[PDB]
Amino acid sequence: VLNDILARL
Amino acid sequence: MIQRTPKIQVYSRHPAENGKSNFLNCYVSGFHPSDIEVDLLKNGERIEKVEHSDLSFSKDWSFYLLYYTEFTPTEKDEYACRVNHVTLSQPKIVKWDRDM
Amino acid sequence: AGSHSMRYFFTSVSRPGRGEPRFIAVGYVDDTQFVRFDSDAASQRMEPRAPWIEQEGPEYWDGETRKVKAHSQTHRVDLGTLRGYYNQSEAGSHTVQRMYGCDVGSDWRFLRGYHQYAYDGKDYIALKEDLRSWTAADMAAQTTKHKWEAAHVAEQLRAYLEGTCVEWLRRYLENGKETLQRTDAPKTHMTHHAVSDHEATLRCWALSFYPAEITLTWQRDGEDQTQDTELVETRPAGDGTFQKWAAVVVPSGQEQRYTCHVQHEGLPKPLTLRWE
């Protein structure tokens, strides 16, 4: 499964 | 804003035998940016029912794609892959050679 | 078993003339693609690409679809941010690429994790091996690093890479054991192609192998030979296995001096090949 985070840069 | 020219390999999925159905592959790799035009050619003419893999990339971030179609090798038909990319002045044509 | 990995790859390409970026995501267990998402495809869902993942229920596919679409929107925002960081016009097309995943050892326990980001084909920011710190390639990325150190980003990634990633990898390895835990040793043979009346190419083939990692080396009279050799990049067969060959030009009649050596996880002992 994919993570559930991805903060913006 | 980096530009890397594609490497090209043209080959069959299985060892080629004339008259025996097979799959013609054009593996393009090492290129950047991702926009690329790939055609498989039969006697210089574009083959219509060509599929391709989902874009992915290598450790140096360069892209790769596999284009492929069903074909039957023969003694007289010439097959090839034709690639164009922003890094190329003119389209590059690589003939299929069953030994490679 | 052996050691194993789960990796996700993401590419977003901006389209300044019209519309949202093109977004393509692929998931791999070892060298097996098992999921994909393409923004240009009709389903707008995460889609299965291996038989063993299709047994996951609707909650799985709804969740992966939500997360991969969220990834695409993050990349869309990032493309806009990076255009400003680098003071680039709105007219050009640009690319962001992301890869993250985990490795486990033979005991299926966590070995390492990674999370790497690139802009226009160059390193931008990457998680260090400790899963705590960031490598920023330039001053734009240094700005991002300061933002992410203040917002606990590496902590969340470390928890995923050491926990969720490894736990689902083990689940996939079990459900897909028929293929994921099988090694396909290379099918090898040697071909001969005259290049004149007195020299010939010997080409050593490795076909239909899995995983993709392999070593092909030529020796002459028991010593390594790189002179007049050619090694192509490992390439996909199109059926989930891989191909490679290595070739050497030799004087005709001297073929027996040359041996091709094949190393692969599926081979208990390396193979040695010699022309007829």
Domains within chain B, CATH numbers bracketed:
1-100 (2.60.40.10)
Taking the mean position of all CA atoms in its chain, how far away is CA C108?
A: 20
Q: Length of chain A in residues, anyone?
A: 9
Residues 6+ apart with CB under 8 A from C25: C8, C9, C10, C11, C35, C36, C37, C38, C46, C68, C71, C72
The closest alpha carbon to C235, from C227, C244, C226, belongs to: C244
Return the number of CB contacts < 8 Å for B and C: 68
**Is C113 in the same domain as C207?**
no
Cis peptide before C51 (omega within 30 of 0): no
Taking the mean position of all CA atoms in its chain, how far away is CA C12?
A: 17
Tell me whether residue C30 is exposed, middle or buried, using C-beta atoms within 10 angstroms of its C-beta: 0 to 12, 13 to 18, 19 or more.
Answer: buried
Residues 1-9 of A with CB under 8 A from C: 1-9
C151/A9 Cβ within 8 A: no
Exposure letters B25-55 (e unless 16+ CB within 10 A, then b): bbbbbbbbbbebebbbbbeeeebeebeebbb
Structure tokens of B43? 């006697």
B100 touches chain C (CB under 8 A): yes
**Is C187 in the same domain as C170?**
no
Of C160, C182, C204, which one is at a domain's C-terminal end? C182
The beta strands (E) that lie in chain C are given as 4-13, 22-29, 32-38, 47-48, 95-104, 110-119, 122-127, 134-136, 187-194, 199-209, 215-220, 223-224, 229-231, 235-236, 242-251, 258-263, 271-273
Of C161, C182, C203, which one is at a domain's C-terminal end? C182
Give the separation between CA C270 and CA C263, rounded to whole angstroms. 5
CA distances from C273 to C189, C255, C259 (A): 7, 11, 5
Whether residue B83 contacts residue B91, with contact meaning beta carbons closer than 8 Å, is answered with yes
- The reply to whether C93 falls in a domain is yes
The C-alpha of C238 sits at a distance from chain B's nearest C-alpha, in angstroms, of 7
- The reply to whether C123 falls in a domain is yes
- The reply to whether C261 falls in a domain is yes
Give me the torsion for CA of B97, B58, C186, C49, rounded to 10°.
Answer: -100
What three-state secondary structure class fits C83?
helix
Structure tokens of C71? 């990834």
**Is C119 in the same domain as C233?**
no
Q: Which residue has the tokens 């995983």?
A: C211
What three-state secondary structure class fits C38?
strand
The C-alpha of B30 sits at a distance from chain C's nearest C-alpha, in angstroms, of 10
Resolution expressed in Å: 1.8
Number of domains in chain C: 2
The C-alpha of A5 sits at a distance from chain C's nearest C-alpha, in angstroms, of 7
**Is C133 in the same domain as C254?**
no
The overall longest dimension of chain A from CA atoms, in Å, is: 22
Method: X-ray
**Is C36 in the same domain as C144?**
yes
Q: Which residues pair with C207 in a beta bridge?
A: C187
Tell me whether residue C113 is exposed, middle or buried, using C-beta atoms within 10 angstroms of its C-beta: 0 to 12, 13 to 18, 19 or more.
Answer: buried
* Radius of gyration (C-alpha) of chain C in whole angstroms: 23
**Is C135 in the same domain as C205?**
no
- The reply to whether C251 falls in a domain is yes
- The reply to whether C52 falls in a domain is yes
Residues 6+ apart with CB under 8 A from C183: C2, C210, C211, C264, C265, C266
**Is C192 in the same domain as C158?**
no
Chains in contact with A, counting 3 or more C-beta pairs less than 8 Å apart as contact? C
**Is C91 in the same domain as C20?**
yes
**Is C228 in the same domain as C148?**
no
Whether residue C181 contacts residue C173, with contact meaning beta carbons closer than 8 Å, is answered with yes
Of C151, C182, C213, which one is at a domain's C-terminal end? C182
Whether residue B5 contacts residue B87, with contact meaning beta carbons closer than 8 Å, is answered with yes
**Is C175 in the same domain as C187?**
no
Query: Best residue in C79, C94, C160, C161 to probe A by mutation, most A CBs within 10 Å?
Result: C160
**Is C124 in the same domain as C235?**
no
A5/C153 Cβ within 8 A: yes
Q: Which residues pair with B37 in a beta bridge?
A: B84
Give the separation between CA C250 and CA C221, rounded to whole angstroms. 13
Whether residue C121 contacts residue B2, with contact meaning beta carbons closer than 8 Å, is answered with yes
**Is C123 in the same domain as C208?**
no
Give the separation between CA C40 and CA C100, rounded to whole angstroms. 23
List the domain range (segments joined by +) for residue C221: 183-271
Angle ∠(C180,C181,C186) on CA atoms, nearest 5 = 90
- The percent helix, strand, coil of chain A (3-state, each to 5) is 0, 0, 100
Whether residue C183 contacts residue C266, with contact meaning beta carbons closer than 8 Å, is answered with yes
Q: For the beta carbon of residue C262, count every other beta carbon within 10 angstroms.
A: 22
- The reply to whether C276 falls in a domain is no
Closest residue, chain B, to C9 (C-alpha): B56
C198 is an annotated ligand-binding site residue:
yes
Give the separation between CA C187 and CA C185, rounded to whole angstroms. 6
Angle ∠(C210,B9,C21) on CA atoms, nearest 5 = 85
